[PDB]
Amino acid sequence: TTSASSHLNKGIKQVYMSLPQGEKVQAMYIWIDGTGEGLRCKTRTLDSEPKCVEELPEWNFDGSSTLQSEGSNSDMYLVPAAMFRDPFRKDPNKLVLCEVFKYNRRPAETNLRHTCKRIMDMVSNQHPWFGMEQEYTLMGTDGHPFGWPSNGFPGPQGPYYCGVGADRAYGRDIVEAHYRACLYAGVKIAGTNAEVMPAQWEFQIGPCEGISMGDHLWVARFILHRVCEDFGVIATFDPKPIPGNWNGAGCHTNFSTKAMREENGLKYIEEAIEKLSKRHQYHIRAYDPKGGLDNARRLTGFHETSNINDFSAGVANRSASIRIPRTVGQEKKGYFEDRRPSANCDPFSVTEALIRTCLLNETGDEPFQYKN
């Protein structure tokens, strides 16, 4: 079933949304809350359209309502970081992604962009590109996957992957709407496909340079939640939404530098993979908002997945931790794919770890403080 809000008359809402706006402009501020997984938002009115992110004012919120601050000193501060066009209200209104700071101006516990940005600036001449494949499952308000038989299961897997038809693909209206909204907003969405599990979907973001990878994915996540709210369904990024013989959800991360993209760049790809082979446990902890417990329910070495305990790598191997595409090996240049991150990973944490291990030559179980 769907939510009570989705049963309201949507034609009424569009009549009000058709009213000409006038001179004022709406800006929606978006930030990550104390769980490191959820998003929050609210709107303020501006006198004129902002042209760049630098001319948006700072804002604030009460951190005791988001489990981010204690009692006495509960005020937290929002600092705009990236701006996009608003697909839900249209031009000239904006979406604003913000960094969160405590009352004493130190970064919040779940503010991982502050450290990630400094790391990205250390290797800016190498031009790192990232590409992330975000998988998710559409859910009903009753906790069951959308379009599944009530208290039951659909047919066995096999016909749902990249499927077409009323009996093969569930919820394509959400997917189509999310795709168009991202393109309007300016998010670098690269494609979509239906997944092995019915009502499971995937969209790809990238290639993005540096810190902009995390900014684009978080805004894409927000747009998906807001679109699903209109239809009355829930999108979940849980790695294993359904137990048993049903496909899980991950966030594959593709990585490349300027050196790897040039001729005979496969040599630098092999060197990065060698460095990654020595830090398996460090990346497992960084690829999860809970230190790796979430990914354990998904990475068991079955259904085209790698083992949580073991590191493996190979060309055109979809059962390994790291996969080199057959085309990349054939042309001796390109990129490589990290298949370990879970679907609920923080992109800032994932991208920072890749830079530290591969480009800054860090060792040990702790990140090196200041420089590399």
Ligand X SMILES: Nc1ncnc2c1ncn2[C@@H]1O[C@H](COP(=O)(O)OP(=O)(O)OP(=O)(O)O)[C@@H](O)[C@H]1O
Binding positions for its own copies, 133-192, rule CB under 8 A: 141, 146-147, 158-159, 161-167, 169-173, 176-177, 179-181, 183-184, 189-192
Query: Which CB sits closer to its own copies, 41 or 296?
Result: 41
The answer to whether 268 is a known ligand-binding residue is no
Q: Choose between 5 and 369: whose C-beta lies nearer to its own copies.
A: 5
Annotated binding residue 202: yes
Distance in angstroms between the alpha carbons of the first and the last residue of the chain: 51
**Closest separation in Å from C-beta 279 to its own copies:** 26
Site string for Mg ion, 203-242 (x = CB under 5 A): ----------------------------------------
CA–centroid distance for 101 within its chain:
21
What is the smallest separation between the CB atom of 42 and its own copies, expressed in angstroms?
4
Residues 288-327, mask of contacts with its own copies (x by CB under 8 A):
----------------x-----------xxx------xxx
Q: How would you class 217 by CB atoms within 10 Å of its CB: exposed for 0-12, middle for 13-18, buried for 19 or more?
A: buried
Question: Is 332 among the residues that bind its own copies (CB under 8 A)?
Answer: no
Site for its own copies contains 109 (CB under 8 A): no
Residue 277 binds its own copies (CB under 8 A): no
Residue 170: DSSP 8-state: -
Residue with structure tokens 């670098």?
188
Instruction: Determine the Cα–Cα distance for residues 81 and 101; give it in Å rounded to an integer.
Output: 13
- The yes or no reply on residue 230 touching its own copies (CB under 8 A) is yes
What tokens appear for 225 in the block?
């939640």
Task: Mark 42-61 with x for binding to its own copies (rule: CB under 8 A) and - for no binding.
Answer: xxxx-----xx-x-----xx
Secondary structure class of 209 (helix, strand, coil): strand
Applying CB under 5 A, which part among 69-77, 230-238, 248-256, 309-317 lies near Mg ion?
248-256
Q: Is 96 in the site for its own copies (CB under 8 A)?
A: no
CA distances from 1 to 8, 55, 158, 232, 259 (A): 14, 43, 26, 9, 51
Q: Provide the minimum distance between the beta carbon of 115 and ligand X in the complex, in angstroms, as a whole number.
A: 22
Strands of 70-166 (E only): list them.
Answer: 75-85, 94-101, 129-139
Residues in CB range of 251: below 8 A, 6 or more apart:
132, 133, 134, 135, 341, 342, 343, 344, 345, 350
Q: Which 237-266 residues touch its own copies, going by CB under 8 A?
A: none
Q: How far is the CB of 12 from Mg ion (least distance, A)?
A: 27
CA distance 75 to 71: 9
- The footprint of Mg ion (CB under 5 A) covers 133, 202, 252
